[PDB]
Design a protein around this nucleic acid. Structure first.
Ligand SMILES: Nc1ncnc2c1ncn2[C@@H]1O[C@H](COP(=O)(O)OP(=O)(O)OP(O)(O)=S)[C@@H](O)[C@H]1O
Ligand SMILES: Nc1ncnc2c1ncn2[C@@H]1O[C@H](COP(=O)(O)OP(=O)(O)OP(O)(O)=S)[C@@H](O)[C@H]1O
Ligand SMILES: Nc1ncnc2c1ncn2[C@@H]1O[C@H](COP(=O)(O)OP(=O)(O)OP(O)(O)=S)[C@@H](O)[C@H]1O
Ligand SMILES: Nc1ncnc2c1ncn2[C@@H]1O[C@H](COP(=O)(O)OP(=O)(O)O)[C@@H](O)[C@H]1O
Ligand SMILES: [Mg+2]
Ligand SMILES: [Mg+2]
Ligand SMILES: [Mg+2]
Lengths: 436, 277, 347, 319, 327
DNA sequence: GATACGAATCTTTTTTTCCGTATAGCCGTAGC
DNA sequence: GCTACGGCTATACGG
DNA sequence: GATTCGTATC
């Protein structure tokens, strides 16, 4: 009378569906942070849902905490409304009370259910408190493990001012660059469960439910079910749920599992090189648009197509095809973000790369668009030109426009100030650097 | 650059309360204030550079000690100080003298960013408690000092009105007149009027029109004069008039408004001018 | 100091380029009461701003060249707390709202609606304050729609003298309410005469006066560019213009020329990626994409190894992709499309 | 007036045996209702195929007389914020109502696709801690609008479009309980205009019997029109231009369909159009989008639609 | 005070018997009312077809003098967000009926302007309170409505008004205003109407204002064409004859003379010549394609401004270069 | 010993409504 | 018995 | 989805 993913949970560490290398790395990290003076203070675990990110920690605790504890885990509970406690200080109070968990009361603090990081005011408090923990002057602190599930936030708001947290729920949209790149933060990213451990740990459940599966004559079509489930999903919880829903059934209901969200580089590779399952490009494009519209209907995707279409043959394809790709991508930019623009700019590229698709082609490695660096260099140029205009109007009396600066006074004036002043405080080098 | 002054609130109540009148106004207007310590006179300035400007003149005889030397012209050094800290210190001294005391303020310029050593004493009841404070300030440059000048006001054939003193029979009536418009929450513009003597507070909007009037006697020492002003400036005018007996109101036709306040210390008279655009 | 801003004429009689444009500006300044709204259009570097300053000097007297700079704060709907510097002076005001960005509406609806409702009654002539809008062609078509009625209704107390080049992206209502003043660029003779004035004033020793002619033809009717070139050449040659003095050119011009040479020589996908890298490098320096496309086209049309068919294809693709960029958001797509089309047509 | 309910509400099934369609799913729901152990489920599909009346009937049968204090139905008309998830759902889960063995409390979160992200992330903990007493039944039209961690703990039940025989059976049941005169062609026309939507079949049948009484092809097609996607498909799959312009004008312009509606339906039809080369399909998408931009800018005229059809035929004949 | 109203609002049908054109919808909603069951209705059609009049007349017939307290009319002029959907519509549907013993009516006009968040929250409001409240949705663009809201409401299509209905309303307007309309002017009004009665009334009012004596003179075709500024049916064929039969020197002169005799606009001539050429028997299948794809581009360029003479010559060029295919 | 499999890498800064906090107004109670 | 002030609370604002 | 490196296993 219970769900099979709760009645067949691992009791030891050897029944956890995790890769051996991943388990070993997590073991080494966790054993490192339990030492008196640990280099790492917070262990961040990223990955998709059901990758045993919390099924390995809650069984490593039972073997590691009662080894360094002088004589389990302390999960943070978001739904705890204390009287006289505003809903932004709950995590602060939890951290303040969790810093006393040291020897003679040692416990590893696990943060799986993060605070309401979808609100702009408490996400900042979350980041600030984590930074305070990472920069804490306390010589002795308990180990901290944060498990963040990488899931795509569905489109619900109606605004083009959507931030990172309104597109993807990942460790980058919750933690700033300083926390992620902090020297005392070890990040062990996880991967979906492969088709081998999923095929073994489900046959375990089947041979435990031997009686029920034999009574309903569900023992000759067993492997055809475990193999299909493992080939469809990389989830340890949804696979067990589907197995229970199929074994408890008494008919021919077609089994189903949760759908996976195609990533950014995954979708770029699907558009450029094509999918290995469907040979019909129309069906693939329609399913990509109906399953990953939050990613296709953006600008970074159309920029990545332009930045990665040269990796089909490592640049060894006809220029007449490259022109047919870029002219369509440019015609799509004038459609003002209409839904008929992305569906054309993703179909023309796929058709172009399909018409030249032959075996023996050694493809290249895709990369993220470089427009984010161009914008930062542009902002640096803006600041330098503002400084040039400021110094040219208080040490002198002359008003000049920004366009004139970028065209003539961003190069000629640095040379003049290098010869008139330096040769025989100020600006002497080219604005925003040379043209290299 | 050596600056040192001594203030005694109990010794002289008028010049001291005008100092309270200047500090409260520069606190209510905006953060930070400009203090130019001329060798013969002080001037406390709050320049937002549409928003109004206050120019209060403080003489040198108000304080017991006014030793001021600097390398600039006429021993002028100009401070930029956060008004919250000095307002808190000043309120602390107000409570010090309210509990019963007669101690003086020793304010010294102790070190471009500097600070003022505002130290005083308090006695509870025959105990010695020393209150030491340090308000961080910045040194304004002489070139930066000359960029700040008092706004000019002319009346070729305009109209200044003598507001009745608040100590008289009509003073409370006129104070109620000025504060009547402040009761409404949804007011942002007031249209002052000048007839030669009646002045009216008119607030006309899309669907409602205030038209408050003063039927009491008025004086104009020795034509229409209307101006559109903000409500916050009217609140500042109310606060300035509440602490002044001699208040001078001059209205320009669609150019500006000036709230002139003066205290007759006679001796140089301390004056507060609120330029309003 | 910069020789551009040290020999700038400060009066209508000190402006020696076009005698016909000075005689028309003097006619405009004869009766300043009925001065209409003016739109000065012409090639860059002609001196339209200098002539506007001279007209303001002839109207309001001297004192229009003492500029005080104050920064005004504007708040959008999202409370972004935007910023804009407002160069001003007695009798006139100068604004380049296009710098604010796409929020230029929030400044032409505040500054141009607050100084047009002041009436400038000082102590009785109300007069008018002249507002110069630099780069009038960069407005986002919403700043102009909120400006047409603004300058039509309040024309009594304000006058607008907008300075722009290539007044195509200016809407028809704005051009209808504004008197259009064309400012032709000087010929090489006038530029050479001006450069002669500078060199005798600065006492630099030139030889073979033909050098000033060379600077005039290299500047392409740009007095600012010609003066900057002259100053750079004199400083690099130690105030001695030798007959073999190198005519220095902007670095981005040389890089665009190298890009054209790469396009002509190498026509492949990898060469296209290198061209994208060069284009991104140029874009990182706040160089407008329209100007980059124009320079690329007119440098590819100067190649002597290309026939008439290739040049016609290049100019057709240039027009098509320029129109595409004018109605687009990301210019890298259009620039890559133009380069790829040129590469495909050349081979 | 009268208290006579519309037949959509008058003939809403109150038992799981009256819900037609998806037999393999309804039978499993009945098996759950008899056994008792109800897993967390997400029921998704097209509108009007019986996703709400299935969950409600399952909860009713599973809880018996404890339905009033054993279910918590939270729809989009209620404030399904994070505070409600943290307080009301938490207190309903913490309730200790005693039930027959195998039975569980059911939280029917209908229209869960409109729920915010933080509410779903709190629901994660809500179903994690309190899973032995209460069960969550999400009902949506799109499964991807529920976050992946929430979909992991649930069992996905994908309802499909109803066929032409299940809808016919339910319509015959209604016509037998309402003494409605009918003809076979009229019922077939009702099925054709329903497009696998039982609600839009009941509504059309009620409108036809109210307006004319007898359910024939004429009385049906004179009150409810043929589906406009199937006319747009006929217009976009013609051979000549003079035969596509006729179907455009006389069947979409003089009938009252807006040009923007025609273009929006044309894009959807082109996306699902079969037996068409992919280059032709993408060119048709581009030409439809170019006309969509013009219509959105203001020029929503019949001449623009004619030009779009002409360009589609141009790309069809050679390009 | 009703005589100081515009003719569009002065002649608004107060009862269901004054709504012309739509017959299969009126004769269905009347049977719905008489039977006693009114389902959730959706009214769809072009502007000026009579949807907002039909629903108000229907509710007036249903409730009589209790229209004010039993009808919640919400339109695009109100902030019909999700908060309003949950805080006004929900408690209007939840509360019991006020003495009428029947159902309440919630009329959501211009529902295509409602957000998807406010439309996905009205679905269960409609479904739950069907017994004591009903919903009518009026829209002209059905692509902005969510599919579930489109499925919960019975759909009634308001066709463009036929010629007979427009002429019968024109007769009533002429009777009330004591006006006279020529037989050749009624056809012109119907043709320019494009199935809109608001255009009928707005043109007839200006025609009455144009007449010097509105009690003796008659509104001829000249009066209509001068008031609405449309080309005459002869000026639309003379220009086409010049373009398709004359040279490039006299066709331009004829076009510029037609556009200057009465100040006709280029777009009106384009849209008239398009209708004239649509009846042609062009036997190339490419002449029609070229004509459509070029005249649509000229029409799109006209809407954004530009040189008028250049576009006028472009029309002549596009019509001339296309028939070269046919020949 | 061949091969299937698996991990790592390929990355980033107009509008509407909602969730939590700031703040002024009003009422209850101590004390002068 | 009356008033000032602290605590509670409803409401507009901000990201 | 592509390449490259590294295992485990049959
Ligand atoms: N062999 C197994 N290995 C791992 N998990 C198992 C196994 N058998 C059952 N489970 C259950 O599967 C679930 C996996 O949960 P976890 O992956 O640890 O949590 P998670 O990674 O945070 O997933 P989310 O993001 O919270 S949905 C737990 O409820 C386990 O009890
Ligand atoms: N399979 C079915 N058997 C019988 N009636 C059905 C069936 N499907 C729908 N209906 C009718 O549809 C109406 C109820 O529709 P619902 O089941 O609430 O819709 P739904 O499928 O949940 O779609 P949404 O998500 O609410 S738009 C009643 O009139 C039912 O009789
Ligand atoms: N069938 C009709 N019979 C008589 N007058 C009509 C008819 N249809 C429209 N009208 C007139 O046109 C006016 C406007 O029509 P409405 O019904 O108010 O608006 P509408 O037809 O619903 O168009 P939209 O979609 O609201 S813009 C009415 O007030 C009538 O005067
Ligand atoms: N008549 C003239 N005589 C000398 N120099 C001139 C003259 N007209 C313009 N200039 C030069 O042009 C420069 C300014 O050009 P600018 O006003 O920026 O041109 P534009 O208005 O076309 O951008 C000045 O430095 C000035 O030296
Ligand atoms: Mg977990
Ligand atoms: Mg439902
Ligand atoms: Mg209407």
């Amino acid at each position: 009378g219970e769900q099979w993913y709760e009645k067949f949970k691992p009791n030891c560490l050897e029944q956890v569906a995790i890769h051996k290398r991943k388990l070993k790395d997590v073991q080494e990290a966790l054993d490192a942070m339990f030492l008196p003076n640990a280099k790492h203070r917070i262990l961040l675990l990223s990955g998709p849902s059901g990758c045993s990110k919390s099924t390995v920690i809650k069984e490593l605790s039972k073997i590691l905490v009662p080894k360094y504890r002088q004589n389990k885990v302390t999960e943070f509970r978001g739904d705890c409304i204390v009287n006289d406690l505003p809903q932004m200080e709950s995590f602060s109070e939890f951290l303040k009370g969790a810093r006393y968990l040291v020897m003679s009361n040692l416990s590893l603090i696990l943060i799986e259910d993060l605070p309401n990081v979808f609100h702009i005011d408490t996400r900042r408090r979350f980041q600030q408190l984590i930074l305070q923990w990472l920069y804490s002057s306390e010589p002795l602190l308990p180990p901290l493990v944060i498990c963040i599930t990488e899931c795509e936030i569905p489109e619900n708001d109606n605004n083009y001012r959507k931030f990172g947290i309104d597109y993807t729920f990942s460790a980058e949209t919750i933690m700033n660059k300083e926390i992620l790149m902090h020297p005392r933060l070890k990040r062990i990213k996880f991967n979906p469960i492969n088709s081998t451990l999923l095929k073994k740990h489900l046959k375990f459940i089947c041979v435990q439910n031997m009686k029920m599966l034999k009574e309903k004559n569900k023992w000759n079509k067993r492997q055809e079910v475990i193999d299909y489930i493992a080939q469809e999903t990389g989830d340890i919880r949804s696979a067990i749920t589907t197995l229970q829903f199929w074994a408890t059934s008494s008919g021919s209901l077609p089994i189903s599992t949760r759908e996976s969200t195609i990533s950014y580089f995954h979708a770029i590779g699907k558009v450029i090189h094509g999918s290995h399952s469907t040979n019909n490009d129309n069906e693939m494009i329609n399913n990509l648009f109906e399953n990953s519209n939050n990613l296709l209907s953006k600008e970074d995707f159309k920029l990545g197509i332009l930045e990665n279409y040269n990796t089909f043959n490592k640049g060894e394809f006809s220029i007449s095809d490259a022109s047919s790709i870029v002219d369509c991508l440019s015609e799509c930019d004038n459609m003002n973000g209409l839904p008929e623009s992305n569906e054309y700019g993703l179909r023309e590229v796929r058709k172009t790369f399909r018409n030249i698709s032959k075996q023996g082609h050694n493809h290249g490695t895709v990369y993220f668009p470089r427009e984010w660096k161009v914008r930062k260099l542009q902002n640096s140029f803006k600041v330098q030109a503002e400084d040039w205009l400021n110094v040219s109007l208080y040490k002198y009396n002359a008003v000049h426009s920004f366009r004139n600066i970028t065209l003539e006074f961003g190069y000629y004036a640095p040379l003049i100030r290098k010869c008139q002043s330096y040769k025989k405080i100020d600006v002497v080098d080219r604005i925003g650097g040379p043209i290299e | 650059m050596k600056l040192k002054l001594i203030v005694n609130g109990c010794e002289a109540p008028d010049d001291y309360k005008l100092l309270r009148t200047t500090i409260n106004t520069v606190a209510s207007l905006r953060k930070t204030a400009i203090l130019r310590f001329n060798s013969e006179r002080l001037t406390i300035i709050s320049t937002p550079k549409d928003t109004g400007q206050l120019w209060c003149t403080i003489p040198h005889d108000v304080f017991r000690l006014y030793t001021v030397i600097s390398a600039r012209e006429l021993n002028t050094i100009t401070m930029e100080c956060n008004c919250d800290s000095l307002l808190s210190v000043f309120k602390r001294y107000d409570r010090v003298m309210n509990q019963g005391s007669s101690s003086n303020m020793t304010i010294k310029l102790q070190s471009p960013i500097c600070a003022l050593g505002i130290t005083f004493e308090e006695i509870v009841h025959n105990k010695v408690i020393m209150h030491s404070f340090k308000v961080p300030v910045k040194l304004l440059f002489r070139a930066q000092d000359t960029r700040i000048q008092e706004p000019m006001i002319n009346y070729i054939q305009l109209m200044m009105y003598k507001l009745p003193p608040i100590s008289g029979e009509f003073g409370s009536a006129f104070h109620g007149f000025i504060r009547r418009v402040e009761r409404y929450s949804n007011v942002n513009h007031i249209h002052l009027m000048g007839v030669k003597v009646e002045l009216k507070i008119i607030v006309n909007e899309l669907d409602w029109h205030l038209e408050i009037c003063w039927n009491g006697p008025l004086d104009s020492v020795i034509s229409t004069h209307e101006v559109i002003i903000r409500c916050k400036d009217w609140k500042v005018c109310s606060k300035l008039y509440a602490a002044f007996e001699e208040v001078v109101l001059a209205i320009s036709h669609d150019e500006s408004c000036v709230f002139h306040c003066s205290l007759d210390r006679g001796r140089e008279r301390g004056q507060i001018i609120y330029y309003i655009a | 100091s910069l020789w551009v801003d040290k020999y700038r004429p400060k009066s209508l009689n000190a402006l020696s380029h076009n005698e016909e444009l000075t005689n028309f500006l003097k006619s405009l300044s004869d009766q300043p009461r009925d001065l209409p709204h003016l739109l000065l259009y012409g090639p860059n570097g002609t001196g339209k701003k200098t002539r506007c300053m001279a007209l303001l000097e002839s109207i309001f007297g001297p004192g229009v060249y003492r500029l005080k700079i104050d920064v005004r704060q504007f708040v959008t709907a999202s409370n972004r707390k935007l910023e804009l510097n407002v160069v001003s002076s007695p009798y006139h005001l100068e604004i380049t709202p296009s710098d604010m960005g796409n929020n230029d509406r929030i400044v032409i609806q505040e500054l141009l609606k607050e100084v047009a409702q002041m009436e400038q009654v000082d102590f009785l002539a109300h007069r008018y304050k002249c507002v110069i809008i630099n780069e009038a062609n960069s407005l986002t078509k919403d700043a102009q729609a909120a400006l047409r009625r603004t300058m039509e209704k309040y024309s009594k107390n304000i006058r607008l003298i907008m300075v722009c080049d290539s007044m195509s992206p200016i809407i028809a209502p704005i051009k209808s309410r504004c008197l259009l003043i064309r400012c032709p660029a000087p010929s090489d003779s006038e530029i050479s005469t001006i450069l002669s004035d500078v060199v005798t004033n600065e006492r630099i020793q030139l030889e073979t006066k033909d050098i000033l002619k060379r600077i005039a033809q290299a500047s392409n009717g740009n007095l600012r560019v010609s003066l900057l070139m002259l100053e750079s050449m004199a400083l690099n040659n130690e105030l001695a213009l030798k007959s073999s003095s190198p005519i220095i050119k902007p670095d981005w011009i040389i890089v665009i020329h190298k890009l054209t040479r790469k396009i002509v020589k190498e026509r492949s996908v990898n060469s296209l990626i290198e061209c994208r890298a060069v284009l991104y490098d140029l874009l990182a320096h706040c160089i407008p994409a329209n100007i980059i496309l124009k320079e690329l086209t007119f440098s590819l049309l100067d190649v002597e190894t290309l026939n008439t068919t290739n040049k016609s294809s290049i100019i057709e693709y240039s027009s098509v992709f320029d129109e595409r960029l004018s109605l687009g958001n990301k210019a890298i797509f259009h620039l890559e499309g133009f380069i790829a089309k040129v590469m495909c047509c050349l081979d | 007036l009268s208290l006579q309910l519309p037949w959509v509400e008058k003939y809403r099934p109150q038992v799981l045996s009256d819900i037609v369609g998806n037999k393999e799913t309804i039978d499993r729901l009945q098996q759950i209702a008899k056994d008792g152990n109800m897993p967390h489920m997400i029921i998704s599909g097209m509108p009007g195929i019986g996703k709400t009346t299935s969950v409600h009937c399952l909860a009713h049968e599973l809880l018996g007389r404890s339905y009033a204090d054993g279910v918590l139905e939270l729809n989009a008309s209620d404030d399904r914020g994070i505070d409600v998830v943290r307080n009301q759902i938490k207190h309903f889960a913490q309730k200790k109502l005693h039930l027959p063995p195998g039975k569980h409390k059911i939280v029917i979160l209908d229209e869960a696709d409109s729920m915010t992200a933080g509410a779903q992330q709190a629901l994660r903990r809500t179903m994690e801690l309190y899973s032995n007493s209460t069960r969550f039944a999400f009902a949506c039209n799109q499964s991807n609008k529920i976050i992946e961690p929430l979909q992991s703990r649930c069992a996905i039940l994908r309802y499909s479009k109803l066929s032409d025989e299940d809808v016919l059976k339910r319509l015959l049941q209604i016509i037998k309980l309402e003494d409605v005169k009918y003809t076979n062609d009229g019922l077939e026309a009702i099925i054709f205009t329903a497009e696998g939507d039982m609600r839009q079949a009941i509504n059309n049948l009620q409108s036809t019997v109210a307006g004319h009484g007898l359910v024939n092809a004429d009385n049906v097609f004179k009150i409810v029109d043929s589906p406009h996607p199937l006319i747009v498909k006929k217009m976009l799959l013609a051979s000549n231009l003079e035969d596509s312009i006729q179907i455009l004008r006389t069947d979409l312009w003089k009938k009252g369909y807006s040009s923007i509606d025609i273009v929006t339906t044309s894009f959807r039809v082109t996306k699902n159009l079969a037996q068409v080369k992919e280059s032709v399909r993408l060119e048709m998408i581009k030409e439809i989008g170019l006309t969509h931009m013009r219509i959105l800018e203001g020029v929503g005229t019949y001449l623009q639609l004619a030009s779009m059809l002409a360009k589609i035929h141009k790309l069809n004949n050679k390009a | 005070s009703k005589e100081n109203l515009p003719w569009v609002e002065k002649y608004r049908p107060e009862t269901l018997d004054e709504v012309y054109g739509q017959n299969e919808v009126i004769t269905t909603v009347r049977k719905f009312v008489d039977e006693g069951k009114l389902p959730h209705l959706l009214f769809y059609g072009p502007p000026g077809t009579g949807k907002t009049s039909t629903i108000v007349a229907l509710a007036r017939e249903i409730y009589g003098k209790n229209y004010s307290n039993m009808v919640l009319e919400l339109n695009a002029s109100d902030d019909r967000g999700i908060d309003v959907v949950r805080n006004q519509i929900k408690d209007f549907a939840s509360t019991r009926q006020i003495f009428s013993k029947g159902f309440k009516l919630i009329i959501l006009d211009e529902a295509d302007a409602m957000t998807n968040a406010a439309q996905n929250a009205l679905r269960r409001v409609i479904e739950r309170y069907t017994k004591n409240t009903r919903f009518c949705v009026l829209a002209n663009y059905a692509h902005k409505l969510t599919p579930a809201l489109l499925s919960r409401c019975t759909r009634f299509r308001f066709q463009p008004l036929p010629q007979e209905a427009i002429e019968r309303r024109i007769a009533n307007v002429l009777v009330h205003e004591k006006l006279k309309l020529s037989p050749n002017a009624e056809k012109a009004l119907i043709e320019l109407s494009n199935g809109d009665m608001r255009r009928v009334l707005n043109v007839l009012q200006s025609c009455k204002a144009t007449l010097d004596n509105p009690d003796e003179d008659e509104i001829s075709d000249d009066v209509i064409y001068e008031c609405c500024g449309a080309p005459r049916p002869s000026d639309l064929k003379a220009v086409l004859k010049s373009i398709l039969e004359d040279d490039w020197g006299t066709a331009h002169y004829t076009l510029n003379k037609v556009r200057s005799a009465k100040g006709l606009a280029l777009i009106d001539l384009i849209e008239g010549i398009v209708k004239i050429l649509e009846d042609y028997e062009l036997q190339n299948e490419e002449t029609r394609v070229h004509l459509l794809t070029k005249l649509a581009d000229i029409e799109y360029s006209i809407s954004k401004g530009g040189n008028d003479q250049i576009q006028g010559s472009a029309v002549i060029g596009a019509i001339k270069a296309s028939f070269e295919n046919e020949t």
